[PDB]
Design a protein around this ligand. Sequence first.
Ligand code: FAD
Ligand code: FAD
Lengths: 614, 614
Amino acid sequence: SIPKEVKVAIVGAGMSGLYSAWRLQSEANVGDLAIFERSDRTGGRLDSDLIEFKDNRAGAGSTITVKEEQGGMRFLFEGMDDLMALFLKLGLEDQIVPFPMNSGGNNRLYFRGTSFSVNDAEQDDYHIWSALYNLDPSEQGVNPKDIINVVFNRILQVNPQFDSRPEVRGPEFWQNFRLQCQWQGEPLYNWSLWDLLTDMGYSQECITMLYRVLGFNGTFLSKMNAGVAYQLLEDFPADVEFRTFKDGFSTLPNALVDKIGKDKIHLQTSIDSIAFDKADSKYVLKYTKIDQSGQVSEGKFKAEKVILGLPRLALEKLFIASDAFKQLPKKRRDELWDTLQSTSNQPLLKINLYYDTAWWGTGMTGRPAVSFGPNFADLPTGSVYPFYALNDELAAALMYDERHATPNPDTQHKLDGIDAAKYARPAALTIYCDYLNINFWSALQNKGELYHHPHESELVESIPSDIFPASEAVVQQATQFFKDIFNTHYVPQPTLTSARIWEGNVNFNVPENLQFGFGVHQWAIGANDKEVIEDLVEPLPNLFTCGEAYSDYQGWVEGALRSTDLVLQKGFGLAPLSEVYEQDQGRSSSEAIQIAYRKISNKMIMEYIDPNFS
Amino acid sequence: SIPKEVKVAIVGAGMSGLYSAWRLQSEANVGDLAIFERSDRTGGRLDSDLIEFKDNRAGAGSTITVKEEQGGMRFLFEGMDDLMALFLKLGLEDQIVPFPMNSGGNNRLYFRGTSFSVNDAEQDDYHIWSALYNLDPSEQGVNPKDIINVVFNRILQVNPQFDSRPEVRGPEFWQNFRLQCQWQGEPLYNWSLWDLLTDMGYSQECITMLYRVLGFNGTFLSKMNAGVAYQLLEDFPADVEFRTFKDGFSTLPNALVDKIGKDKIHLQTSIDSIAFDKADSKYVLKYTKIDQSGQVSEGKFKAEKVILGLPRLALEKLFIASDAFKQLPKKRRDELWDTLQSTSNQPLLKINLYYDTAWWGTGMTGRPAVSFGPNFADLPTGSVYPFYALNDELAAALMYDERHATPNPDTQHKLDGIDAAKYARPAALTIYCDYLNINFWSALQNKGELYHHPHESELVESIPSDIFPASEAVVQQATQFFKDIFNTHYVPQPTLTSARIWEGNVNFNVPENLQFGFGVHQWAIGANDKEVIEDLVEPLPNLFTCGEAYSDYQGWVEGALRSTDLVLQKGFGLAPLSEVYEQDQGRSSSEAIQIAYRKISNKMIMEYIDPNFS
Ligand SMILES: Cc1cc2nc3c(=O)[nH]c(=O)nc-3n(C[C@H](O)[C@H](O)[C@H](O)COP(=O)(O)OP(=O)(O)OC[C@H]3O[C@@H](n4cnc5c(N)ncnc54)[C@H](O)[C@@H]3O)c2cc1C
Ligand SMILES: Cc1cc2nc3c(=O)[nH]c(=O)nc-3n(C[C@H](O)[C@H](O)[C@H](O)COP(=O)(O)OP(=O)(O)OC[C@H]3O[C@@H](n4cnc5c(N)ncnc54)[C@H](O)[C@@H]3O)c2cc1C
């Protein structure tokens, strides 16, 4: 039942739409709102899967669960102040577990037909990179990612007017970095990273090594500017401690939906166009709803305020079709369309292949065991990430591991058995790539017949509805690249698969459950995002825009939250959540989350790993 | 003066718009037509430049002229039957000169930090490719482009139902190739080239070598399908004899404009939207004209028939804004928009750097002289093509060269002096690249200040208005890549430059003289172009579409001509020009053009090279 009029109409049940409604209900006493979501699910670019595997090893109708992610998978305790505050207010801190990013040097690298480990690559003064790439003398004998770091240091050095001193380098730091720093008199947001390194004298061989070794090449080869490219590249230090939720990032939007109420959320309801009723000072919203039968139904309704929690492509579609934008004078209407062009569309994809057991441990490869983190390659694969069945003991061991503790022999021996035991349980690999590698897989995914392991029903309970299977061709090609990357003859067929290509669609032939926006966005060459961001808060009276795409912290949920906060401030008087958290708690969400996690971690370690722990 | 009503309104003064008007006037007695062109020039993606250089060598106000191309540059006597017929009917055959494509093995190759010649690369069983790329055994010891040829032969072999016997492989052959041939049960237009070679077992190393060595990578890395990719790859045999016009491809549209009349061509007149007056059964065309002052003026007019000689992006803009398309029922309107999505947009660019003398001959490099054809590199440069000052003796020598004749010592000695003399005259290099390399140069072109050689006025007479200079950064980076490619310390600053980025624009901030459509187009994955082509001839009653973008022969003027012929047939009863030519002449345009050129060539050779010639 679509209401006749609401105080606030929220378009999009992604993080920014859900977060808007939750903060409005809770902090502004707005009860007369509704969320309108075109797909059959909440959460947008957060999309977890919990697959329940039949426990089929000899000594066992018991079940084992593998969490996977089709969208976002990780976050940080620092520099994500709205997100941390949001976790604490929803009481989700007790579900936070490690997201480890290395295997002590055993992670795989595949470049120019050669398979090797992270440890192999450091040997002999990083010799392998000098053998694989025709590098200049100043480009040899250094860890490739330290070239990125050094260049960053040089940028800071020639911009002394630019502060460069906060030990938490957050969105304001990164905005000022790309808008204030220059190289050779031109500011970084007028530079592409590719041009920049070239102008600095780097060989094309070295540049190619850099964009292949990082597994994501849009920072180099797309239309994003160098300044925002560096915000992304200096998000993955070596000393990263990422975290995630045990049951997946979807924990967060699901918790938001519990607080909001399913009755105020209208799924399978696309907002087609928007007009303004000058008589009663109300927006009018054309929608198309799809019943559970499939029975389509068009309709209209009114709203005092409209919040568009939507990325670039969806805003463009709305803009084109909406009288509210057309009735605008040509100058301002053109200026608004141009402003939408200021953030680049970054396609992403995740292909998840699930296995009844893991085959990349030492028992199956005869080579040093691969555990956690990205396995990078200049193959279309881009990056490959392992996922394991949920296991409390494993999570405690990983919590122990992220401490600087030095286990005694008995603790180390229990850790060893725990590390090895995860290979005997169901597990999965994610293929995760961007820009240049998208087209290899999309053509593959849409060709021929889809993959299904025979007797699927006999091993996997139910298959979630958000899972669309990988094509047979995708599985075939992924399997061959896995043999390359993991240097092994043995890669079995998967028991379950999923393909998700986060690439914007403009074809009417596409089923609803296959329409996805662009994976992420990043500011383009020439974008003054300080001007663009403020222009997009409230582009018409009482019609608001927010989300990741035009945010402070593109790539991340925190961007959606901070962008939405600007709407919540200007249209409703709400201060930023992180600042509201601090005044209510007497400390920051960062400090609070660190302390709470330390307590949960300590208890997990003493319960599962070392009863006599520090 | 914009007329009140016309019988036929032609939108676009590219080849398809000009060709439509010329054939309608001449063969259908339609005098009440007009052409409406948004830019300040005719010809669209054909754009020649004739630069007149002050003759400043010691023994000389005499002038020397360098032809260059910002768009199309070459054609073939075979497989281009409309174009040949068109040349003959306009009497342009006497201006046809060779477009040579090699330097007897001295052309340059730059791959993975290494500079070498075509002759070097064949040495020792193509050893250099095995040293530069980590190739499989079945990929070593063969000329890279012969891998493309072999794979093509294998495709033909497993499709015996597919004829594969015409010795002129024309657009019908290539359409049936991509729509009828299959690999592993899936037809070629559902395949990407990248997926195809991978599925055939080629290494990613070999695939990368292939798309770098060919200098154009969209065939591999874009959304075009494998079948149409092969139409393009098997357009450049080793035994190519391309030709061009002495004064550039612009010779052709300029000749069309002479026949049509400047009074029926309305420059700086964009067609904004289209509606249908149901009362008088007429289309109504909203336009925006720009006076010579710059004084804008909106207006409207009517037309009985409308011919849209426009590519994908321009048709999309019209479609969105036009009541004639909006009043369409949602099913057919969506189906039409989807049909527009079936051809991929291929960006291209040409950057032309002019020099007072050529510096890539042996006198300046100390290395074997580079003459004609593409110098390929895995640098952003893609391909580099030399152009020389116009010289009758040089053209005759090149005409002699394309024969299989074997000069005696005195003829060879005169040829030697002619080959060497072109380096002492003004010359130019074109940087010509596609897909993956576009973003490197666009960011460079729009950064910082534009390039101007001091005392430009003192060396170049007038600068044509279609010339926009390369940025200083573009020149800087091109100069360094030239030192790499040509293996030389010495690359001087250019005397004149031009940058043309054939990449579709959707920003209102762009001056008119910087708005260009996509360089070329190619059918996408899943496009049944036989259905798409016929759907796009006359999508609404008396409103027609044609041009290269949705044609039989994408990439080439012949595609525009053949697409337009379909409009001329269905809306006006005109048979294809090539068939009209044959009935009027008693032979084909191919045979006619070969004979006429042979006569011109013979006379040039006897006049300049060998008075006693075969
Ligand atoms: C592969 C991938 C991995 C990521 N990993 C991480 C990570 O590790 N950490 C992190 O912090 N972030 C990560 N992110 C980013 C994070 O997912 C996003 O920044 C955030 O979820 C986007 O939220 P949003 O509200 O801005 O937009 P969206 O999530 O895209 O929500 C927009 C919603 O609006 C709906 N919609 C669109 N048009 C209409 C319409 N006309 N009517 C109704 N509804 C409409 C869409 O269906 C969608 O639900 C990742 C993203 C991707 C793609
Ligand atoms: C770099 C490059 C090299 C090429 N080399 C070759 C070659 O060697 N050989 C060959 O045969 N072909 C070549 N081509 C292809 C050839 O240039 C094209 O196929 C052909 O010129 C396209 O003609 P067209 O009429 O289809 O479109 P266009 O030439 O693009 O003409 C469309 C015209 O419509 C105008 N227009 C657009 N929208 C509007 C509007 N709303 N109102 C009014 N006017 C409008 C545009 O300004 C333009 O003049 C090359 C192309 C490129 C880009």
